[PDB]
Ligand binder design. Sequence first.
Ligand code: YL6
Ligand code: YL6
Ligand code: CL
Ligand code: CL
Ligand code: CL
Ligand code: CL
Lengths: 341, 341
Amino acid sequence: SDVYAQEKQDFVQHFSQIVRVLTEGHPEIGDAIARLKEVLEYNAIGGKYNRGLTVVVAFRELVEPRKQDADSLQRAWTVGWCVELLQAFFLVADDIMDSSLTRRGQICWYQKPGVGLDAINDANLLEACIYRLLKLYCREQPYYLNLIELFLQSSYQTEIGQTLDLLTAPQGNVDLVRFTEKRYKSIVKYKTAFYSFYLPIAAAMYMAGIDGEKEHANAKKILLEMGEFFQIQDDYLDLFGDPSVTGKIGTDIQDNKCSWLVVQCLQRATPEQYQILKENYGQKEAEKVARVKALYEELDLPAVFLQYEEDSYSHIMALIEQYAAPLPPAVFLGLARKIYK
Amino acid sequence: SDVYAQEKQDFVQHFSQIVRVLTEGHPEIGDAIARLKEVLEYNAIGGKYNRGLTVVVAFRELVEPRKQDADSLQRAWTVGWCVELLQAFFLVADDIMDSSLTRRGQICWYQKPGVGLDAINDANLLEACIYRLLKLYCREQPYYLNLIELFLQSSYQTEIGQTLDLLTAPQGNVDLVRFTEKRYKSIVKYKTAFYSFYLPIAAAMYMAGIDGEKEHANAKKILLEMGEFFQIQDDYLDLFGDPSVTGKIGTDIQDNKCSWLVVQCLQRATPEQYQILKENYGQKEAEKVARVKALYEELDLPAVFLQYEEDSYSHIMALIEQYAAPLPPAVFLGLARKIYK
Ligand SMILES: Cc1ccc(-c2cc3c(N[C@@H](Cc4cccc(F)c4)P(=O)(O)O)ncnc3s2)cc1Cl
Ligand SMILES: Cc1ccc(-c2cc3c(N[C@@H](Cc4cccc(F)c4)P(=O)(O)O)ncnc3s2)cc1Cl
Ligand SMILES: [Cl-]
Ligand SMILES: [Cl-]
Ligand SMILES: [Cl-]
Ligand SMILES: [Cl-]
């Protein structure tokens, strides 16, 4: 808690250097490069950097300390920042698609005067910056191609999950029949879990010389399952999370989201309850949102969640027991600690 | 003309197989994959396939015929289609950013009922498909990493050029002071020339085992210069091209575009003419567009263009003379033939 959040400070320090090298004898693109700088400064800074940091922490846990020279650690910081750029790319584009107003407390980049739909290009640049950074810092390393493929695959999985989410939850289309458990698991796995949990550990593994298919598959089984719980808790806190403790106030119900809650509610609802949901879900009427929350409450979804979090915790510890070796279980336990608070 | 347009038929034939392999034991993403199929069918088909085809023609010219087996030609078709996907990605996103209505004769993908801003994700998928295809067909080839880097770099150059264009030509901002020759050359080089002319020949070169830095630099010098002329002629035809001969009718003036014409007009205009341009450029008033065309005409810009096309043709032939070897000059002359019509 005090040692993990020290490591956070150095992470954010490295950002200036990330930006410097991404923004260098080509005079008349200078103006585009200055715009690239604003995009990076506004969109890559101001999160909690959990994904990026995971690359750094894991790399330190997986390498023998007498192969951790200044250049080694530099590359770990940089590939951490690559994960944060991938995420910035997804967020900027996602906020346009959903018509969001704010992000990380502030006006979404695309809503800023003079940006608008130009944010589409800006997001594309954020994505491109990943591969410039990999080239600049890792091109001579034996894991180079492995990291390129990892990021590309992570992008594809995320885009695919996003497609599935958009089909499943059209804004302005009350359709609870799309909102099944199988479909919810599928969205979370592709859209969130691969890039948030598998990507950063996998990156660290490759940087450490652990490139085995089986080892990667073992780590993935643990990490996708943590990803699933992360999102489910995220859906629960959207509506039941003390809002001064989380940051946010939730709009999942308004937004016709395929949330963990609605899925559970629909497995439990009578025909009558189905209709209260059907009349009220995915509307912005405060009163219509009241009566969904109330339905969820009457059905003891908070209790169902707590039961789920307990079960999920034993399942995760079992998976770690079974699939962590020959990585140190600490690699996985550090992540479990941050999400099963 | 009859032999080049035969080779076009086989190109488009291969498309079905492209789509088949991109759309395969993961049941519950099936719906996303069906959406991927529509995106590909609507946006990758219906151009003239000049960029993709250039990969195939060049590959055939650069390889010894007794290393051109069925698998070899398969990979050339596929990397051709990769160039067409990159272009589909850029077009779909560009039409959103510019608020275009039609493309290749039909309603732009994003303007279609139920798509809208979801087209941002769809465009991202088109981009992703490139690297799936490279992996599926080229992962065992020694040029694999070279092609990945080439496409990534081509994407970055294009995005950068797009940034510069957006800064230079804000819709709803009469600013002729941004519209210099240096800035115009710079936009065309990054936004158009690298991916339209350098990318497909470079791809063919790598597939042929020609990976030399110097050879690539030599080919680039010819190909960027052809790219520049292509765009300049494109700007001329927007306004002076018989519209039944081109396909289109032009909206460069309306659109506050940094066209070759406005740049030239501004090097030639008196203070008085500057004001007619300043009052009339980048407005949708038919009469205001009349009076720009008329200014261009009074300044003999059609004559200036024809002089430019002649000069450009000698310059291109000189560059080919000087920089083509040891590639067959036919590689470059085939391209010159298609654009200096
Ligand atoms: C690998 C990894 C990737 C992402 C995270 C994240 C944690 C987190 C986050 N953590 C909160 C707790 C939390 C919020 C939502 C779901 C959850 F499981 C835990 P906090 O400890 O910042 O108050 N809040 C918002 N977004 C994220 S993303 C954590 C990890 Cl270990
Ligand atoms: C490598 C390469 C890449 C792109 C092309 C293109 C030709 C072309 C194109 N060609 C017309 C001619 C033309 C149009 C605009 C500029 C120009 F130089 C030539 P056509 O022969 O289809 O009537 N029209 C619209 N877009 C494109 S893109 C041609 C080549 Cl050789
Ligand atoms: Cl080193
Ligand atoms: Cl997977
Ligand atoms: Cl073979
Ligand atoms: Cl270059």
